[PDB]
Design an enzyme around this catalytic site. Structure first.
Site, PDB file in Angstrom:
ATOM      1  N   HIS A   1       4.980   5.215 -14.195  1.00  0.00           N
ATOM      2  CA  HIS A   1       5.955   4.461 -14.342  1.00  0.00           C
ATOM      3  C   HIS A   1       7.064   3.370 -14.041  1.00  0.00           C
ATOM      4  O   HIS A   1       7.422   2.840 -13.765  1.00  0.00           O
ATOM      5  CB  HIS A   1       7.203   5.605 -13.232  1.00  0.00           C
ATOM      6  CG  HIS A   1       6.387   5.153 -11.783  1.00  0.00           C
ATOM      7  ND1 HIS A   1       6.270   6.356 -10.969  1.00  0.00           N
ATOM      8  CD2 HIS A   1       6.093   4.277 -11.442  1.00  0.00           C
ATOM      9  CE1 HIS A   1       6.326   5.687  -9.253  1.00  0.00           C
ATOM     10  NE2 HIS A   1       5.934   4.379 -10.338  1.00  0.00           N
TER      11      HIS A   1
ATOM     12  N   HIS B   1      11.406   2.935  -5.309  1.00  0.00           N
ATOM     13  CA  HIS B   1      11.010   2.284  -4.359  1.00  0.00           C
ATOM     14  C   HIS B   1      11.844   1.125  -3.992  1.00  0.00           C
ATOM     15  O   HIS B   1      11.957  -0.228  -4.703  1.00  0.00           O
ATOM     16  CB  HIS B   1      10.281   1.720  -6.159  1.00  0.00           C
ATOM     17  CG  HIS B   1       9.311   2.425  -6.579  1.00  0.00           C
ATOM     18  ND1 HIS B   1       9.554   3.303  -6.897  1.00  0.00           N
ATOM     19  CD2 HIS B   1       8.218   2.030  -6.717  1.00  0.00           C
ATOM     20  CE1 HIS B   1       8.196   4.014  -7.809  1.00  0.00           C
ATOM     21  NE2 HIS B   1       7.165   3.148  -7.190  1.00  0.00           N
TER      22      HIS B   1
ATOM     23  N   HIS C   1      -3.731   1.247  -8.311  1.00  0.00           N
ATOM     24  CA  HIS C   1      -3.815   0.211  -8.224  1.00  0.00           C
ATOM     25  C   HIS C   1      -2.993  -0.929  -7.588  1.00  0.00           C
ATOM     26  O   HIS C   1      -2.559   0.147  -6.261  1.00  0.00           O
ATOM     27  CB  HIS C   1      -2.807  -0.328  -9.509  1.00  0.00           C
ATOM     28  CG  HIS C   1      -1.441   0.786  -8.853  1.00  0.00           C
ATOM     29  ND1 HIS C   1      -0.870   1.966  -8.734  1.00  0.00           N
ATOM     30  CD2 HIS C   1       0.222   0.343  -8.726  1.00  0.00           C
ATOM     31  CE1 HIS C   1       0.034   2.512  -8.385  1.00  0.00           C
ATOM     32  NE2 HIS C   1       0.492   1.562  -8.754  1.00  0.00           N
TER      33      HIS C   1
ATOM     34  N   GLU D   1       0.640   6.013  -4.608  1.00  0.00           N
ATOM     35  CA  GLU D   1       1.460   7.350  -5.010  1.00  0.00           C
ATOM     36  C   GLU D   1       0.981   8.822  -6.183  1.00  0.00           C
ATOM     37  O   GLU D   1       1.888   9.250  -6.579  1.00  0.00           O
ATOM     38  CB  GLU D   1       2.019   6.459  -6.627  1.00  0.00           C
ATOM     39  CG  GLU D   1       2.760   5.604  -6.225  1.00  0.00           C
ATOM     40  CD  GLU D   1       3.086   4.288  -7.641  1.00  0.00           C
ATOM     41  OE1 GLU D   1       2.738   4.833  -8.130  1.00  0.00           O
ATOM     42  OE2 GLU D   1       4.504   3.558  -6.965  1.00  0.00           O
TER      43      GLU D   1
END
Ligand SMILES: [Fe+3]
Ligand SMILES: [Fe+3]
Lengths: 132, 298, 298, 132
Positions: free
Chosen positions: C11, C60, C194, C241
């Protein structure tokens, strides 16, 4: 486990409207109205002109008329919840006992005497279909 | 780092209003404030006064509106202001929290699979502050730190009585792993039978409340299986507040002693109850008398 | 009333940036967009478009700041606006919810012992809308209803893989008891490997990622046991995530069929993944190619 | 199950500062400040005079200096979380790829070439005590 059966038993309780999802979505604007009265600036503007203040919240006509008439039973019918609505009768300077007694159709004096004597008995107001 | 004591107490706003107006000693209120006196005199004793109170209560649409409804939340802030519920902010001192223990407990409950909501800013309503006023009186600052633990019983469903009893057991476990040696209380507030809405307002069920007190002491695990419909039918639509007595109760061990129980009808719309429990192994002596039932019907 | 399909999509905000600046077809972005084309065509076919998407993602620090941090939250509003994350609101249609199904699931999960936070107002950030733009393109309005389901992965701890895996099975059971015959999707977004912070930023771990995909399909139960530290070590600080992909996966049965898998390095800072899974028993034909891996190093 | 052993593990990951309660408490003011940049009004004010704007947020002298120097590593040492701070670099018009590479010491070009070539390898940077 069954949400549907869990909600359906609430309907057999006399004289009581349980604050379920369906009531919460119905009363959303009416309960958020009542919440704005926590701020003193909002209380004083509301008391200076109820009807204009009420017109900023997008209530149904039945909800707005319920407010203006201070009919707590009608307000609960439109999805009002007693704890959000307690902001309104506190704005007016009334106690929770007043408010609660005003929903029973007893006078204030009788409701106060009834409590002194032990409060309303459960007998006869547990189940609509049983009658007990 | 230990839970020494479990207290419950009703949190009816008219109590904080009798104090504010100076009528806490008239004929209606007098017997109520007197049934709290043994709690005030017990708690000031050296070794009985908590360092921190974990105060479990339902927010009454004060900190939470219709936009954010958490099932279980914990206050991890340093200060909490008394909420304005319509009458102006209650004129009592700000509640001082304990951020190191509050955050330890929140991280521990999530590790133990409770989906907690952490609050770092929130006002505390009558749910939280009325019991402080009843038990500690009217000091210039509260004599201890307080961690506010708000539980939803406004929009249905509330958490099950099973969920609640398990939660008090994980709160106990997290206080025991906190490395400072603190004297920690869990209080549950609210109840007992009452109904604030509708043609059945006024409902009082002293049979249900006295059996509730009984089972809470001697068989809470059984009491934990009572479904919400039974609270509602029998103890009024706001009787559901008693689920929080179960959170306090699951933070103490299987065996407890009751040091003091007060039960009075009426206090505004409700049957008022207040109790002190301690783990049997470390309990002090019960008070004399040990159980007080007041009001004209009692 | 049926969960027909599970989808996952990364996303990353740069994807919606590429869409807005028409660079979506340049040398860097082109292979990413081409990889989504088969998804875009499949979902559009007669019978594949869902009536409703339960969309599971991490906020977020958009809808939630430091003051209110829920573990699990569900959006029950009628409408959600795109958040302003610093560039102004994303220029995409408003997301429309489905209050009846959203409320039904919220009430069911609570009765199933999850401590849900109910959200009746909130903005949806990139975690929620980038996936929409990648799967549905740039319609005037989205072609289905969407129930946003935010999960905390920002402040530690996040919920565990096992709690996520179980929550997805409960969502599925709430869907099935809803009395309308709706085609419902559960999407998990985020990932893959990441790290956005510090000296170790830029971390990519294709071995972890491809292993994750393999086990999600075939042994989700074992994968749900991997502890937080392992995600953080091997897949970077933001690779946490991926626990959301367990929510999606728990809403499908033991036996699923991967229709389509895309994986691509790099996409901004991250290893992009995307997939479509259906219950074995009702699954359609796999796409062709069924599996595509891209990037200069793939 | 033991909160203390759960957290202590995080300190064995090199180049990485996991957002635990202790950092969250320390960065509370710095992250609230960044959240304020979600409003277009606040961005214009912040931009007009940064230091004046920073003075309303009660930051430590170190936290304030890190923001004005845009040093993202030092902001994170002060409790800042990258998701909150993304609102700062986004108000500057930067991307997440700019902000991440800036914390690596690499140049914007060598950071971008390393991503194109497959990213930073995990080998050697998973554990301080174990060296892998
Ligand atoms: Fe109450
Ligand atoms: Fe993300």
């Amino acid at each position: 486990i069954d949400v549907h059966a869990y909600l359906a038993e609430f309907d057999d309780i006399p004289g009581t409207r349980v604050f379920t999802a369906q009531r919460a979505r119905k009363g959303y604007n009416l309960n958020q109205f009542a919440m704005s009265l926590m701020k003193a600036e909002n209380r004083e503007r509301f008391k200076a002109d109820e009807s204009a203040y009420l017109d900023e919240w997008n209530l149904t006509p039945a909800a707005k008329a319920a407010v203006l008439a201070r009919d707590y039973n009608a307000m609960i019918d439109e999805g009002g919840n007693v704890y959000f609505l307690s902001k309104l009768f506190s704005t007016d300077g009334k106690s929770f006992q007043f408010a609660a007694g005003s929903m029973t159709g007893m006078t204030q004096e009788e409701y106060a005497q009834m409590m002194i004597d032990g409060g309303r008995s459960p007998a006869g107001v547990r189940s609509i279909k049983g009658g007990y | 780092a230990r839970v020494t004591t479990g207290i419950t107490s009703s949190h009816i706003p008219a109590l904080g209003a009798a104090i504010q107006t100076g009528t806490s000693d008239n004929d209606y209120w007098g017997p109520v404030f007197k049934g709290y006196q043994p709690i005030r005199d017990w708690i000031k004793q050296p070794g009985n006064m908590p360092d921190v109170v974990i105060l479990v209560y339902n927010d009454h649409a004060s900190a939470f509106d219709m936009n954010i409804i958490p099932t279980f939340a914990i206050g991890c802030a340093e200060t909490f202001k008394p909420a304005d519920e319509g009458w102006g902010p209650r004129p009592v001192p700000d509640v001082k929290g304990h951020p190191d223990l509050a955050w330890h407990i929140a991280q521990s409950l999530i590790l133990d699979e409770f989906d907690m909501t952490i609050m770092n800013q929130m006002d505390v309503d009558h749910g939280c502050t009325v019991p402080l006023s009843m038990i500690f009186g009217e000091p210039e600052e509260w004599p201890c730190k307080v961690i506010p633990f708000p539980v939803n019983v406004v929009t249905y469903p509330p958490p099950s009585g099973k969920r609640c009893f398990a939660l008090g057991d994980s709160i106990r476990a997290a206080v025991e792993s906190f490395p400072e040696d603190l004297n920690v209380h869990v209080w549950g507030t609210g109840g007992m039978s009452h109904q604030l809405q509708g043609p059945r307002a006024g409902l009082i069920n002293k049979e249900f409340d006295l059996n509730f007190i009984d089972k809470l002491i001697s068989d809470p695990e059984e009491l934990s299986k009572m479904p919400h419909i039974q609270y509602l039918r029998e103890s009024g639509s706001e009787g559901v507040e008693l689920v929080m007595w179960l959170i306090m109760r699951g933070a103490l061990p299987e065996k407890v002693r009751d040091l003091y129980t007060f039960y009075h009808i009426p206090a505004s719309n409700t049957a008022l109850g207040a109790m002190i429990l301690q783990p049997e192994e470390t309990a002090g002596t019960p008070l004399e008398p040990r159980k007080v039932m007041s009001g004209h019907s009692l």
